[PDB]
Amino acid sequence: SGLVPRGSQILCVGLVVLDVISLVDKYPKEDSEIRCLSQRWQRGGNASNSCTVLSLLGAPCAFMGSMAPGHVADFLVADFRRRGVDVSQVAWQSKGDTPSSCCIINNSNGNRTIVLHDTSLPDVSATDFEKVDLTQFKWIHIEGRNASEQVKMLQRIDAHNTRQPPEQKIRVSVEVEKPREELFQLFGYGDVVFVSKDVAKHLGFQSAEEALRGLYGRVRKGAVLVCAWAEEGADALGPDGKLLHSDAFPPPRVVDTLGAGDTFNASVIFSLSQGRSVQEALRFGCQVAGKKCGLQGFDGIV
Amino acid sequence: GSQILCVGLVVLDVISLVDKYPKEDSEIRCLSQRWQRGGNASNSCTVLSLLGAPCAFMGSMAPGHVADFLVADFRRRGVDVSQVAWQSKGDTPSSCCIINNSNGNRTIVLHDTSLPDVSATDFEKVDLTQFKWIHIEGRNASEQVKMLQRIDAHNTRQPPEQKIRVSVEVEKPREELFQLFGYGDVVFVSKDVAKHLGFQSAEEALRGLYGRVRKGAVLVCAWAEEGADALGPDGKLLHSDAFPPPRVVDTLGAGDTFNASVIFSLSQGRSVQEALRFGCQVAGKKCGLQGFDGIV
Ligand SMILES: Cc1c[nH]c2ncnc(N3CCC[C@@H](CO)C3)c12
Ligand SMILES: Cc1c[nH]c2ncnc(N3CCC[C@@H](CO)C3)c12
Numbered sequence A: 001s002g003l004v005p006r007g008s009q010i011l012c013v014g015l016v017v018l019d020v021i022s023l024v025d026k027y028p029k030e031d032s033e034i035r036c037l038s039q040r041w042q043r044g045g046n047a048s049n050s051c052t053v054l055s056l057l058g059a060p061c062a063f064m065g066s067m068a069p070g071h072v073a074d075f076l077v078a079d080f081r082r083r084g085v086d087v088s089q090v091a092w093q094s095k096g097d098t099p100s101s102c103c104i105i106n107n108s109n110g111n112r113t114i115v116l117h118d119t120s121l122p123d124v125s126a127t128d129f130e131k132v133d134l135t136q137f138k139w140i141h142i143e144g145r146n147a148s149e150q151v152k153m154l155q156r157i158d159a160h161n162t163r164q165p166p167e168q169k170i171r172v173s174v175e176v177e178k179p180r181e182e183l184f185q186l187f188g189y190g191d192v193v194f195v196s197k198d199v200a201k202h203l204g205f206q207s208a209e210e211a212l213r214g215l216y217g218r219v220r221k222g223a224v225l226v227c228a229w230a231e232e233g234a235d236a237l238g239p240d241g242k243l244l245h246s247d248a249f250p251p252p253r254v255v256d257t258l259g260a261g262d263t264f265n266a267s268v269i270f271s272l273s274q275g276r277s278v279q280e281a282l283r284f285g286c287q288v289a290g291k292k293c294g295l296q297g298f299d300g301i302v
Numbered sequence B: 001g002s003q004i005l006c007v008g009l010v011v012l013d014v015i016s017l018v019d020k021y022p023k024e025d026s027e028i029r030c031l032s033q034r035w036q037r038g039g040n041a042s043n044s045c046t047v048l049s050l051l052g053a054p055c056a057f058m059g060s061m062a063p064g065h066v067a068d069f070l071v072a073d074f075r076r077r078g079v080d081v082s083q084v085a086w087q088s089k090g091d092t093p094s095s096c097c098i099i100n101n102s103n104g105n106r107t108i109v110l111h112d113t114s115l116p117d118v119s120a121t122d123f124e125k126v127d128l129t130q131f132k133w134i135h136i137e138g139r140n141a142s143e144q145v146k147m148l149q150r151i152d153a154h155n156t157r158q159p160p161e162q163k164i165r166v167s168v169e170v171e172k173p174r175e176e177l178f179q180l181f182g183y184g185d186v187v188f189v190s191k192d193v194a195k196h197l198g199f200q201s202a203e204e205a206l207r208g209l210y211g212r213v214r215k216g217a218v219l220v221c222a223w224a225e226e227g228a229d230a231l232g233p234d235g236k237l238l239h240s241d242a243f244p245p246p247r248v249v250d251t252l253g254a255g256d257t258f259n260a261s262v263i264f265s266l267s268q269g270r271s272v273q274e275a276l277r278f279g280c281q282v283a284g285k286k287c288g289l290q291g292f293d294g295i296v
């Protein structure tokens, strides 16, 4: 670990996983030995994917998540490094395994069959977070997971900010991506709040417009609420009450959708961290995420 | 001539242990997962080493951290890797494996990395004098036949006391592999190959395929829980009942266990009948355990 200049990095707090994905002709019959058409060993997870996108955009970035030593962590660490991601903030667990999965994509019908391996590795805690020196970060993005612990992380950033001049304040964003009640208290934190179409739909909202208008009362004064709605583009709503929208930039053919949401989030953060307007950041997010949809993985999203 | 050589594949097996076989389009949580060194010839080496037999492995490997895991695993077992055909181009093959805990059924989705297979030229470089037995996992047929001819030629310039015993495994039902029938003192033919050729039992497959073997060879056919059979030059059919564990939890590498145990028993001077029983016994014990430890 080298010298990191003060206020230089974008930190993403969240999950990492190893997805081994095999493309097959037909679904394997039990007890057989078959040859797949293609196989990919892919690093995944929301905060993890956002870090890859930030590095490709030209931002110094860091990942903070829980990992346990082992073969899976070795591959994942080498993959983060291959993507220029700073792993120095990883919270190494003394017991357990790093999450991984085996996925089979049937070419004949596009069906995804997944076998998850999760040893319920302890999440990043408020005590893990207090030990971090915040000065090297200009932006902190939190993937909503263990809400009561994450609220303490958010309150610690808020206390740091109170004692800083405006140019030295750390910008904060949160993502509420899973429809779990406990996460809904995170709407009340951060400068930028991302709400997924899936959470919006589970809350009974039928469009990005309904979601923003219906959830804006849950956000902090002055915060921007953002909701991507796949092929319908994305919307943002700020304190001025003006609903902002950008149309989608669909690829010629959609090849890979995992994790186009994470590419959108990382692109919005990047553009806002560069001093661009909410409208400009929305458009940039739609452009990059839309481009990612027609590409396998993250190469060439530029 | 004190080591046993196995020529074939070394594969990283990513294993998921499930309570029931996954239904298509489902998302399930497995009981447990592990990385295990696989590949047929590679698994036979693991078994030969636990049986106490000095052994060596010969197959293609590409450098990296996965190869570092495979190599350190070979070395931990005490398998000699000095003959590994190290590549500069490609990556190590890996497979996604499902093991059903309710019956021990194993389902393998192999990723073949187009790694160049071991050639006749790579084998010519092998100093045959250190080996008492050479087993070849059938893959690139024409190249393997030249390796077999090289062992045959070596044997002609040796007394019957210093002759290298040869075994061949025809596991995949691929036409090219049927010439290997063919060569060697012992020919292992899978139930899978036998069924594809229209045979319904190990005995019917042995009578139907004995014409294809070289003079004085022994043809061996394992048939899972029906046990295993063998046929030698005397025309006498030999059978061994299986040794099923009360709870079959992992049959991954059970076939490799049977092959290595038969080879070991025969390399020790036991009869074909005794070697068959031994193969069934060790493979059966393996079936009731996860992996290879405790087969003793
Ligand atoms: C990389 C790694 C795998 N398993 C680990 N377990 C504990 N600490 C680690 N390290 C030590 C070097 C410095 C640091 C990375 O930047 C953390 C690791
Ligand atoms: C552009 C596109 C075509 N088909 C899609 N399907 C799903 N998501 C999409 N994304 C990714 C998230 C962000 C969203 C902003 O427009 C676009 C697309």
Ligand SMILES: Cc1c[nH]c2ncnc(N3CCC[C@@H](CO)C3)c12
Pocket: B222, B223, B224, B225, B226, B227, B228, B242, B243, B244, B245, B248, B251, B254, B255, B258, B279, B280, B283, B284, B287
């Ligand atoms: C003993 C047993 C129970 N269930 C099995 N299922 C598959 N193979 C089996 N093996 C291993 C290969 C060799 C075969 C010996 O004839 C037995 C078994």
